[PDB]
Amino acid sequence: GAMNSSNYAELFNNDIKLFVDDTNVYRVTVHKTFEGNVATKAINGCIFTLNPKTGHLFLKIIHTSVWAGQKRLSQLAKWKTAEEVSALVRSLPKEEQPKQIIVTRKAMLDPLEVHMLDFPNIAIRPTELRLPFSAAMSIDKLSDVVMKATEPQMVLFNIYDDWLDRISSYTAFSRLTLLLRALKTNEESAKMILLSDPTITIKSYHLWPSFTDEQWITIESQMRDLILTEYGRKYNV
């Protein structure tokens, strides 16, 4: 059944599972036409498929050519996501295939279920958590590889950098979702927090800066400050 605050440590046990987020698959800019009507122009998107235990991110880039000549694109986007996730699973060795796939939006359940009929033993699950994976395109290196793609492409990352050398996967996921929630609520301020000090750099093979344990406590504190302020602003409280 659905994933929530009550079964949260299940994410960090030793059964392989993946989160699938489809919120950045079909992306558009809305604009005016010469006649003063409105039109969309698609831009490149991505499927965010994440192993929360290991940090392994399977970023399938969705090139705008996949939408050419297609109708009902927001509906197609869900089935395209499910097709690509199913293709990924089929490409993995059996001992690497997930036992569960958790979708961040309930509208992905039937598309993924139908595409995974061949895998009756893989559980497809929703979640009650409001996870901030839509903010993945606020991570500069992920945004950069999606926007430069000239064709469909899969790119593999570890979204935790080297954190698991020092912290547990529960703690790594907590840090990730705190960073992403910040980027989602106020991208400019969040990004200022992360880079203000120019002596802390991002390694070429990493996504986030090379903070010490102490600097991560400061950073994490600054992100929680950001999120609460914005919340008082949002809600005048």
Partner: protein, 300 residues
């Protein structure tokens, strides 16, 4: 016009014959039902006064044999039996008619309701859904489960309706996942009509039989099957025109006949609203949509 005599009526019981029903008192001098129209299947069904649970009954066709009812005090129900001695049967029935101890099947001449509810229903197909091959008639009751229910437990006492499942490899062609899930025409026309049922008459017969078991016995798996067969057609973009016109007539008479007080359990809100207002066939069921809106507007 044929006759189903009763040996006796030892327990107080409401007896149904098709869409009609009569109350019989304990040890009342009741000896059966006469003037039953030839040419149709029929169902004779029972609800004991002391146990309004377990509605049960028998599907039969008088062209297939001479049938009668006899109460069994050990198993505690009215049982259908076949009499193979035709002279013994004629002689028994003639005496009971002479003594006017039978109710008459009470059909109004103008009335085509039963024909319209059973148009495509054939005894030989009933007997493949209800497997008990030593009898010519078929027992059904409120509690019997369907083969598909058993997959989600006694196989001899099951309703072997055709399994329909929209998220199944049978229903979804590899590589046409989205196409086949959103437009079920493949599954309707190739898998079910051409493959399993052979023609739309057999499809409609099973749909009609499922409805009647739902209505007369409150059989929940039958109600599921009826709605699934409706939904498969309504969710197909490509349906032969004659099938849609016939479906409209079929459903109209089913909705017309349903007890007003049973609409809350026997009608699935989601299926009906989808079929009449969201589906490919939303504009193809004029008679059904009109009676639904005037009789059960709350459901919609």
């Amino acid at each position: 016009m044929n006759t189903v005599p009763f040996t006796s009526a030892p327990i107080e019981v409401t007896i149904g014959i098709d869409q009609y029903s009569f109350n019989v008192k304990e040890n009342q001098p009741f000896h059966g039902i006469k003037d039953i129209p030839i040419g149709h299947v029929h169902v004779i069904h029972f609800q004991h006064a002391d146990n309004s649970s377990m509605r049960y009954g028998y599907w039969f066709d008088c062209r297939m044999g001479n049938f009668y009812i006899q109460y069994d005090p050990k198993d505690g129900l009215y049982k259908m039996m076949e009499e193979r001695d035709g002279a013994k049967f004629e002689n028994i029935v003639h005496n009971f008619k002479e003594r006017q101890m039978m109710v008459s099947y009470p059909k109004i001449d103008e009335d085509d309701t039963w024909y319209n509810l059973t148009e495509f229903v054939q005894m030989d197909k009933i007997r493949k859904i209800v497997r008990k091959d030593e009898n010519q008639f078929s027992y059904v009751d409120s509690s019997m489960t369907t083969v598909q229910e058993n997959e989600l437990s006694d196989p001899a006492h099951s309703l072997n309706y055709t399994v329909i499942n929209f998220k199944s490899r049978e229903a979804i062609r590899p590589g046409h996942e989205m196409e086949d899930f959103l437009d079920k025409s493949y599954y309707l026309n190739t898998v079910m009509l051409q493959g399993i049922f052979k023609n739309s008459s057999n499809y409609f017969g099973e749909l009609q039989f499922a409805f009647l078991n739902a209505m007369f016995f409150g059989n929940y798996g039958s109600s599921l099957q009826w709605h699934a067969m409706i939904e498969l057609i309504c969710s197909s973009a490509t349906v032969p025109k004659h099938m849609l016109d016939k479906l409209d007539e079929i459903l109209y008479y089913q909705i017309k006949t349903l007890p007003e007080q049973y609409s809350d359990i026997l009608l699935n809100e989601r299926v009906w609203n989808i079929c009449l207002y969201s589906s490919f066939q939303k504009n193809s069921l004029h008679n059904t949509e009109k009676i639904m809106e005037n009789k059960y507007p709350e459901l919609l």
